[model samples]
Each structure stands twice: as C-alpha cells, then as structure tokens.
Target: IVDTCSLASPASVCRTKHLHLRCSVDFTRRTLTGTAALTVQSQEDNLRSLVLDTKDLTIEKVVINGQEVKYALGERQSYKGSPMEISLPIALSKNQEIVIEISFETSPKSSALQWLTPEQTSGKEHPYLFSQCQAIHCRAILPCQDTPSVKLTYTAEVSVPKELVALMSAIRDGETPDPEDPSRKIYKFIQKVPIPCYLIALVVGALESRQIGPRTLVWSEKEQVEKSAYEFSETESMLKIAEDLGGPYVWGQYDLLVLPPSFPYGGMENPCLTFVTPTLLAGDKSLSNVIAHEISHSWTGNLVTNKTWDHFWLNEGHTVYLERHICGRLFGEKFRHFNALGGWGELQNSVKTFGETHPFTKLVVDLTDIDPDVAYSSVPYEKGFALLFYLEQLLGGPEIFLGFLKAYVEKFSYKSITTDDWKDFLYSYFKDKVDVLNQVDWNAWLYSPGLPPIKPNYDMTLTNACIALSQRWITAKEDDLNSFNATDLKDLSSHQLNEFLAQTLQRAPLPLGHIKRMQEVYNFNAINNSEIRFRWLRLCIQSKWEDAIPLALKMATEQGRMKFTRPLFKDLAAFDKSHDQAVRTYQEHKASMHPVTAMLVGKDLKVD
Candidate 1:
C-alpha cells in the first residue's frame, strides 16, 4: 500500500514486508558483500515483473523463491541511479507470498556509506564504517523499494574483523567478545517493529559503551566513552518525559553513539541507536536539546510516518512541537520560549536563503520527479511546528490539544499517513469543534509558497535583558566602547548567551576595538560550545576581525556538521579575501568530512 504513491520509488509490483540481510563488512576492500532477501506480497494478480531502485552496486545474480532468475539492469540516471528489473518467470497471484533475493557488493562510490581509515578515528587502531541513508541514499548500497512510506521489519547478521565491533538500528545480544576465532566477529540484531528503510543503520569500528541510564548506553571510541556518557546522562529522563507527553518509547533502548568528527548532521534519529556528532561534547550539557528532539521522533517519525517526502513536515513539525514541550516541562516555561525564539530566527533565515516563493519554503511541497536532497531544509520543522503550536492555542491550550496528539499517534501507529489524511482525521476527531477548524485557512498553509500567515506569540521573559545589553554594545558611543562589559553575560545560560550574541550580530557592528576587547575579555575566540563559538566566529568574520581568522580556520577544519562547516566554508571563500586559502582549508580537511558534507561544501565553494 505504501509503494502506491511515492514519487521516489518505482511503480510497485510487490510490497516488501520484511528483510533478512546478511553482510560482511570488508575494510580492506572498502565494500559490503551481502545478500538481501525480501519477503514480499504481490500487489496484483498475474504481474510478470517490476523494477527496484539501486545505484553503484555490483549485482551477482537474482533469485525468486530460491531459484535463479534472469534480470536486466536498466539505463542509469544521474541521481536516482539504475533500476534492477527482475523477471518473475512465473506470474504472481494477488496476495501470493514469495521471497526475492539479490546477492551484491557495494561499489567504492556509495553515497550511503562513509569509510574511515584507522587514522581518521580517535583510537587510530581499527577502521570505521557507517551508513547514512536518509533522503534516498540506501539504493546506493542495495536494491529495494527505497521509500520512507514503505515500512518493513528487518534482521541483520553483520560480520566484521574481530578487532572491531558492529552495531545496527536494532537491539543486539549481550556484550560478548570474539568467541571462537579472534580473527573475526559477527553481530546479530533484530527489529520486530516495522520501520522505513532510511532508519536502517550499521556502524563498525573499535567501539566501547558506557551506561548513561538503565536503558541507555553511550557508545564511542576508546577516548570519548566517558565524556559522551556524561554529556547524555539525561537520556533516560528525556525518554520519560516523551512517554508522558506522547504514548510510549516504542524503541527498546535509547542508545547514543558519539561518532567520529566528520559526521555531517547534528544528530540522526536511527530507531534505537541514534547517531550523534562528537562535536556535541562541549563539556557542558547545554546542547543536549538535540537529544530531546531526536527522542520525540520515536512518536512522530518512527511510529507515525509521512506517506511521502512531500509530507516531510508531518514528521519534523510535530516532533519539534513535542520537543519544545518536553524541554519546557523539564526546564522552566521561559527556557522553552527562549528555544522557540531562536528557532524563529533560523526559520526566517532559511526562508530568505531558499527564496520565500520556493516550494521548499511551503509546508507541503511538490517533490514529484525532484530529488529530495535539494528540497531539504528547516522550513518543515519551523513552519510545521508553527502550525501545530498555533492550532494548540486555537483549540484552547496544551491540555486541550494533547488529547489530539495522543489520538493521532495512537490511531496511525506503525503506518504512513499523508497531509490530507492528517487533515481529514483532525476534522473528524474535533467534530464538536468543527466551527473552530472551519475558521482556519487550510490551502494557504499546505500549498502556499511563503512565510506563515500567522506568527506565534512566544514569551519574551528571557530575552528582554539580552536584547537590552546587545543594543548597548551595538550602538554605544563611538569612543565609549566600555558601555557594555563582557562579564554582563555571566548569568546567561548557554541558550540565553547565544541569543545575545546572535542579536548583537544582527545590528550594526560594534567597533573593531570593541570586538577585540570582547574577544580578549571572554576569550570567545576559543570557546568550546559549537553554537556559541559559531556565532562569535561569524561575528569575527563579519567585522573583519583579523586575529580571529586562524581560529575560524581551525574550527572550520575540525568538524563536519553543516551548521558550522557550510557557512564557514562559504564565508571563508567569499569574505576572507584569500579565496585560495579557503579552498585549501576545505581540501585539506575535506577528507575528514562525510561525503554528504563535502559535496555540499564543494558546491558552496564552487569547486570542480
């Protein structure tokens, strides 16, 4: 049923319900030799054949019901890649259950995989391999109905070198060592709950784990185990809060992985094992809101998913709303408003960058025949959250609207639902309040390409002092540079501190002397927190802060999260005047970045 309407997936002849995967990770060859056997049910009676998506894979042969069948590789497209056409040989009757198998190995140029050498890892002992399959990249590693709408439970037995370890998005057995042979080890994992293909993750490396909570473990290399565990110790509490707000934590364990420096995103929600960037180890737990955000996805994305990429906002928007509530419930109500204020600024910037009229700026986009990568952004998260938050207010309040959240998720658990499906259900559930629902304009919100017609009313309790102080520095007397003391921010939380810095940057630049004095007094040039450091460094670049360039270069070359990397690379090439230096820094550290990050940065740098 899910394969019927997805724009990214090919026309379906059969639907995959379960996957049995057996793979051997070869670090020596930088490839995956594996067999993917799919248990499928035919969509139509007397269907002869159909095609599946694949890219950069070497297929050995295909078999249906354990018998080898003739197959043909179709013409290759630029981003979608080649399709694998399997001849059923015998027409499948409707409701007929059959097993289709493909034996293949990943090519060197897989977009879904990032292979790190021994030196690239923190331990410098064994190599590492991880997979990022979101936004349509899984086809690069194997063939399947690669769409988020298609949910299938999976089982995998991944073998790696004995000196290393392996993990997946499912639960594994005990912490056993290399049993029989020290030369090799095989990790077994199972996920009985159906999940989209994009959530399938596999990581192999020299790893260790530390218990952060009873049900949560932080896994990382030898060096970062303790720090990562300390930073995410609140994982258990977040889970508790999400369960209270939503229904339950469907995933068994909320494990965390502090991955290598080159991980692209801030964090990826991969079912039980969420992959995080090591950049989050700021010694302080100020940035752990990402943990809360990903945890909320258990109810939003992993359980009730978007029927297609066009409805991605359904997954992100609701999760952001839930994330704000979780944060608000834990911290004071003001802290939640503080995060929302920050998010609003980001939303405006993203809309400006993407052009307000761009389809991506709208809540529901038209991704038909379009690659989902270019269509990705924060519009869905912010704009969609705004809609939900607005609806909550319109429907009385949180206590009144939470009934809807509970009903919606429980109603659609383990299934894909579209925007229309969501709207229909909302109207039906609130039939008593039909008059209220009728007042809202659905068309402009869903299909219109621009900013939201209605803006949210967030509490301004936390930002008043921050805004006042920032204005003093940005517009103080020309010579009276001491009007604002750097220590005035001593009481601000990292979130509040970041707000002040960002607010100051938006106004007229402080005198270069003022910038220098601020940097010297606070030593913000060497700050460890990525959020704070990024804003300060951006200010430095804008003010032409000469001494700050080297620090910027160092930060730019260190991690791979695009929040810091993409902007740094763009400004370095565009603002530093030494464009060659910018390109050189990216090239030198480019090897340390994931291919997804590297490719985007190259596009920004206009590299060949």
Candidate 2:
C-alpha cells in the first residue's frame, strides 16, 4: 500500500527503485543543481507513469532515454510542496528497466540546505553548506519518492570549489582537483546499502576530520576537530556494544559528522555519516549518550525502519531503549536509569504542550495531509521508550528481552515494518509465550491518543541529589546566598547538574533573587555546557531578572539550536517590557542559524 503520510509519491514507481544522484554545489547562488537518474525495475507491464515529490525547486527539464519529455507540476499544497508528474512516452515492460532523468536546482528558500557565511563558521574564511533532509525535505534537493517507506541505493558525484571538501551519507569513493581550475574539485561517493530518502545528507566546507577509530572519523570545522574527536572517543566501543546487543554493524563505516551549534536536533542517524549538534561537545564528554542514541539507530531505524511517518515511534522508541541499554553497560546500571529520568521530563513537557488527547501523543499517529515535521516531538522518543520498557518488563526482563531483540533485528534487518508486522512476528517467535504477551495492550499503546497505558519504574539512582538540592532551594531563606557553596557541586557530573536545574524549574517558581544566588554560587555564567546553561537561562527569563535580559540577548546571539533558542526567544518576547530586544537579537544572529532553526525561531519572535 502507498504511504498516505506522503502526499505525492506513487508506490508503483518507488517500489522499483535505485538512484544515481549527481549534483554541483553553487555557493555564489546558494543552489544545488542536480540530476537524479532513477531506474525503474518492473516485473509486469502495468506501470504507465511516475510522479515524485518536490519543494522550493526549479524543474528545468525532464528527459526519458535521452529524449526530451513533457512534465507538469501539480498544484502546490503550501509547505507540503508540489508533486512532479512525468508521463513516460513508453510504458515499462516485464522485468524491464527505464531511467527518468530530472534536471533541477534548489531555490533560495530551499529547506534542506543551510548556507552559512564565513563569519558564521569557526574558520571565518570559507562558506559552509549542510543538508538536513529528514521527514520531507529530500525532495527539495532532488526528485525522488521522498518518504521513509521507500528505500533506494544511491551513488552521487558532487562538484564544488576546490578549496573545500564534500561529504555525504555514503562512503567516500574518491575526489580529484579540476584540471582547468586549481580552485575547483569534483567529489565522488557511493552508498552500497539502501537507505531512506531522509537519510541522504551532504556537507561541504572548511571541514577537517580526525580518526577516533580505524573505522570512525569525526568531521567538524578546522578549529573544533580535535575536541570533537575527544568528545566521541567511545564511538568504537559503542559500535561493539551495539553489535553484541543487536547484530552486526553493517553500514560498512560508522562516522560522526559534528555539525555547527545551530544544527536542529541533537543528531541525525544518516547511515555512515551521523549529523550531530556541537552542543554535545560538553567539554568533558559527559553528553556522549547522544552518540549511543545515534549508534543504536544504525540498527533500529537504519536497519529495521518504520513503513510510514505515523509509526515513527518504531524507529525512535527502540533506539531510545537500546541507547539506554548501551549506556548502562558502558557506564553502569544506575547510569542507564538516570538517562531515562532526563528524558522523562521532556516526555511530560511534550504531552502537556500538545495536550493529552493530541494524535501526536500516540505511538502510531495520523500524519495525513499534515507535515511530519509538525508531528515531531519527544512523544515518539520518550513515549516510545516507555512502551518498549513496559514490553521488556512483561517479557521477564532485559535478559529475556535481549533474545527477542536479537531475533527481531535478524528478521527485519534491511526491511521496513509496521507495528502490526512487529506484533505478527512476536507471535511467530514467542509462540508459547502468547498468553504472557496478551497481557499487554496493543490499541491504546499504538493507536490511542496521549501517554501510553504503562509507566515503567526508573531507578532514581544519583538523581536523588538533584531532587534534594531543589527542595533545599525551595525551603531556603530569602538571604541564604552565603550558606551555599560553589565547591559543593564539584563532584556532581554534568548530567546530574542538568537534572538539578530541570527539577528546580518544575516546582513552584523561585524568586529572581534566589536564582541569582544559585547562579552566583554555581557561576553559571562561566559554564560552557549548553544543556545546564539553557536551564539556568530559562530560570533567568522566568524570573525576569534585570541582569538576565542582556544575558538572554547574548545567549540568543551565540546559540542557534532550537532546543534552547525557541524557549529563550519566546520567553524573552513574553517577559521583556518592549519584546523588541529579543526581536533585534534574532535579527542580528539569524543568518548564523540553520534554515530549520531560523524558521522556528522566526515564528516564536513573530519577525520576518
């Protein structure tokens, strides 16, 4: 069946798919002009036409077997974009292969690529370009089925300025400098393994890489390459742990792409190349759990993918569960549950923000005619983890659950599966344990709106210190500033400090004076950790501190990740007397932000 979540692509054309993608990056015009040669393999002569998805694109020409053909653009559906409908002069026959060549270029408003000027980069010498194609943005870059339900093997040859290096989700084939121009080069890449359209990523700029492992390389701008390598020093070990828990890491190479601070999510699991936010570089590498999350995705999402956007939980929930498992083994059992405790706050906030009955709260959601990006939230991640946790408990424990995982990955590896496919396979594997599995609710967990049916118990472990500190602040006297000591937090890990800030914010609002005292004692202004720093800034905004207004302005200018920027901008606008300060702060730094981050922050600030 065709994926209803996607508005344009037809299953017939996509099911018979393999792509040869070629493009040239034009920094001068901020465009990616490309040709996508799609080979359609048909078993029967029933297919007549093929239509693919596109957004913010200029469809310059279309050809079939070297002959120019006529193509029409369907009526645009706003942000969902328009579909490209091409009529093949000759239909495909049994076991026949046909190639449709699309010549296109991205517009200035293209959502996938974020063009950063030299000043925005650490090098301050060359421009940077990176793509975030997750959900539906891949079509804007090239003509394709543009949905997770469809997977294809792709090979790309990208031409760019000789001074810069271009990289992708595929293994690097090789590169050569242009003979005509010493300042230009054409890069080559090939992805032997099939991947969903959303995972097709590209980055070109003043990027350098250092080997963390023989197989793993950490890519970042010239200045941060060494720190980036140190931050993810455990990449090789995490890969080993994932192999032991699941199956083999079949992506050939597992490399990490540590993108700029403005990169939207914590990371993107783009096969060989995983795009991560620089915010994860917390100096001491305590936030390396994000690496675990993306590593786990190599199996959960990249291997056993969801058939549609609605069942996105199948990708994220399993990854979150496995990420914690890997974290527990690498660190300790107590460390595993402590990570879950961190996500618990995010999950609660997501449910409350969207309202309990919202369709997005469910494990399986309805994204029909709706943008999958809007449906993005912690619900799929946290709620999905909860559901997976409940199942693990029901099947006895991790000792027992691990067997189910090993078998399931082997069964569904390299294939798409729905929640039903998962349930059907469960009965097939655990035939005798049917009665035990029957105790779990399938409907409410997958289909019902808002929170799952079960909430697994997380071991508080070290998080108790966080709760204790919050209570102490709530009970402290008005002038208790002198009693608190900065040295007391020396032993608290960065994660524990994050928990402390999060728990304090959840309770009754503390006075402006109180937070100031805590900041003075903790010296939050001197902190480099973005997670804990964002929490402190949020507290500053909530209390409307006189000193914090300028601090908020500075944080907004320096940080571009929406995880922190959105709340800070929205709160500053809501709290500041004129709200113009927040407006001006964004205008000053918006150019440094990623396209997606700028869009969300623009909405919060209500600025152009």
Candidate 3:
C-alpha cells in the first residue's frame, strides 16, 4: 500500500527490518555525525534501488553489503523532506536481505533534533540535545523508510559529553568511556520491539533520573529532577489501570522524560521513554492526565500501529478512548466523562478554526501531498474518541466494547494496520451485534468533515457545577456581579475550573467589567495551572482587555505546547489592537521555539 504522506518508496517493495545507528553529538557544531546500517528486505523481485526519506543531511558514503554504491538525493520538499536513492550493486530477487550502511552528517537545521544552548537549559552550563521525529521528521535525523507502515527494531550507540547522560527510546544496555576520548562516553540502547522510525529518539544532557515506580524512572535536569519525580509518581498506578483496561505493558520500562519548555507537544509516547513538556509541573499533578494519554499509546499506538498518517485516528482515537477508560478507573466514570466533555470542546474549537467543512477536520483525512503537521489538530484524538464512545453506547456499553478492545490489541499486536482492518475486527468480535453496527453511518463518521455525525450523551455529573457557574458569569449583569466571590471558585477542582472557563469562552465574550471582577475575586490571573491559565487568558483577551495582550503573549511564548500557544496566538491576533503585536511576538520568539512549533505558528500568524 502507498503511504501518501511519505516521500519514500512503497514499503511493500522494500523496507527496513532493523536499524543499527552510531552517532555522536557535537555541541560546538550542533550536529549528529553518524552512520546508519539498515537491514532491508525486498518483497518484490529485481529491485534496482532502495529509496529512503531524508532532509538537510550530508551524505558522505553509501555501502551495500560491504560494497560501496552510488547514491543520489532528490530535491528537497519543505515538510516531505528529500528522498535518498541508493543504487544497488545487483538486482535483488524476492525476499532478499541486504544491509545498506550510509555514512551521513545531520545539518544543524535538522528539524527533528532540537539543539538547545547552555543558556536555554535550566542547568545553564551544559547544552542539551533531544529529538522529536513524529509526523515524518525522522527523515531529518536518519535515512530510512520514515512512515508508520514500516516498523523496525533498532540498536544504537550514542556518544555524548562525559558529564552528560544519554537516553534513547529503548532499554539502556550499558555505557562506557569512549576509547577515542576519555571526556566522552558512548551510551548503548536496544529496542527489541519493532517501531516506526518516528519512535526512534535520543536525548543527551546534564540530567539525572529517580526511580518513581518499580518500572519507571523520571528523568530531567538537576533543577527539576525531584519535582519531576514527584509529578509523575503516580505513573505506576496509571500503568496498572492501563494494563487492566488494554493489556499488559509490553515495553519493559515505562520511563518519563521531562523535556525543556520548548518541547512542542504535551507528551510524546516514544516507546520506553515518553517525553513530556516541563509545563506539566503544575505543583499539583493536576496536569498528569497527559501521562495517561501517553501510557494508553503503549497498547493503541506502540503495540498496534496506524498504517499511515491518513489513518492516524487508529492510533490516537483508540489511545484517547483507552486513556479515558484509565481515567475512569482512576477517577470516577463521571470524571472520565468530564474529561471527554473537555475534549469535545477542543474538537469544536479545532473545527471552528479550520472551518466546519474543511477536509482536515474529517475523522479519516486524505493526506496526499499534505504535511501531516499542517493537518495536525485535536480532531483525531477527540472525534476518534467520540466515535468509539458512540459505538460503546450503541452496542451494549463499555464492558462489551472493552472486551473487543483487548481482543483488538491482541490480534493487531506488533503490526501496522488501517481503519479497515480495525473495523473488520470490530465486526467479527461483535458478530451478534451486526444489526447495531450496520445501522451506523459509516461514511459520514469516517469521511464527513465537521464536528461528527453524532454526539454521545455524556454524563454531566461533574460538569454541572462548572456549567452552572459559567452560565451565571455569562448572564450576570453589573449588579449581579456583587454576588460573585472567591468562594465561588473554592469548591471547583482545577479541571472543573478549566471546564468553567472553557464554557465561558464558547459563548459570546464576557463583559470586560465581569472579567475584571473575575480577576478581583477568582484571581484566575494568579493561577499556575497551564490549562486553566490558557482558557483564562483567552477569556480575558476575548473580552478586549488590552492589559491581557502582553500577559497572553508572555504565556504563549514562555511555554511551547501548541495546545496553549497556538490558540492564545490566534485569540490575540483576532483582537484588532493586538493583531500586530501577536505577529511581532511570534517573530521575536520563533527562533527560540521548536522548528515544528515555529512553522505552525508562522502559518497561524499568516507570516512567511
């Protein structure tokens, strides 16, 4: 099958089965110079060349099975990257295995690798290097089939500064002082589980790790090591709930890495090591739900994968469904539905931003010649969850549906599949409920663009108070404002307050006087919770509060999570007075932002 989002040749023709990478970090040059040995097998006969995706990489030499071969780099496409074509020494027969070793150097501008200066890091003495390669950025780091359709096991030896610690998305094998230089060390890693190239990760820095659970380690800089440990201390509990709901965790160790503030996503499920944003340290573990999402990926994404970017919901939607189930077990069913309610709000926001009928808003999008980054949004996570939730309700509730989920994972484990494969399994597992499934609107749910074909009737047990308070604020006159006080918010949890603020933003702008009153009594401006802060700032800016312009811009620039930064930037830009300032602020912070974050924000600002 063809992966439209990838520039590499079809994996059915030729694909990498295993990768052995050796690289060293050069802080001075901000590059990773290395050689990648890919064990490839041809499924078709008489293949002449093997094509791999790459970007901004310097190819020095190419060898196939110990024999040097000529290679060429295709013209670079902005997001698709350049394709590397390796000439074959001889036409290979079907099922032929060959080891292609390519010596290469990564450009400083490699989009996958984020090279932070000493000043950018919290330690302020050692530079840090980390990679975020999802959605096709893996091509920027190494040459390989960079699509989810191809899953390959990998082993690596990453050399780093002697004073630093190196980690990968794999089991730590061992480390030894470099034979070439005593001031450097080579850290070895082995990922026995086959994964897409995008899951291949490496991080090196002045870091430390603390055992938070029997099988978990929280890694971060010296300054935040203890805090990071405390924040994710409940990882084991979440893992237990996930295992019961989905299946046993196959990736031996479930480690958490607290990346620097500039890390774009809230959490990236990179096999054994999941990377989280520093913004998660809310001092209360209030934001730890992001951990649940990443944990669910162990079953939904890592074990059973999406065939291509077009079928991303097979990975994310399933994960979100499992994540909420984990949350339902940890919290209550009401709280689980409450989080789903918040997710629906996020989906609506995405749909509105993209225009209701936009192709990218569909559950299954056509990603041909489209950058997955550009098509990225909450629609997949939320709408996908909605579909699954609807099916659960339509076909005898969670218990029956969950049984099917476990069976789904078991059947698809260690394989990459599409929506069709998943759907077929669902039908087979619930054969008795064929009528119920047949009645479902398959076309509208899968292909239609908009909110969704149907909305599940979510329990409002937890959202009642937040919705009531939000309505009170929305309809409150200047005279009614006197009844509001700090106590009004005292009973609400952080997540509830987030729901309250979100409900308020979904309607017409709140009066500026009422927003001031909120600042006076609720003091949402002083809140440290990033989620709450995001909605609160957006509410303030939406009310045309000029003072909030700089405050909102500050919040957007301080942390790079697109969930918070992108909307805040959009809200500020919509305000007539702050429009120009929003663009300027992005300009000032673009260089400091992650490449993915910067490019997306540039598109948001309609600049360059």
Query: Candidate 2 lDDT (Cα, whole model)?
Result: 0.83
Error of 3 at 448 (Å): 0.3
65-155, model 2: which lDDT tens digit per residue?
7898989989888767888888878877766788888999998678898888888888999998999998889887887787787778889
Q: How many residue pairs in model 2 have overlapping backbones?
A: 2
lDDT leaderboard ranking: 3, 2, 1
Clashing pairs in 3: none
Q: What TM-score do all the candidates reach, one by one? A: 0.96, 0.96, 0.98
lDDT per residue as tens, model 3, 1-608: 57987778778889899999999999999899999999999989999987899988899999876878999998988778888998899999999988989999999888898889999999899999999999888989989899999999999999999999999999999999999889999999999999988899999999898999999999999899999998888899999988998878989999999999988899999999999999899998888889999999999999999999889999999999998888888888999899988889889988998999999999999998788888999999999999999999999999989999999999999899999999999899999999999989999999999988789989998899999999999989999999999999878988899899989999858899999999999888888888889889999999999989989999998888898898899899999989998998888877877888888899888987
Model 3 residue runs over 4 Å out of place are none
**Model 1 residue 576 CA deviation in Å:** 4.0
- Top-scoring candidate (TM-score): 3
List the pairs of residues colliding in candidate 1: none
Each prediction's RMSD over C-alphas, in Å, is 2.2, 1.9, 1.1
TM-score result, candidate 1: 0.96
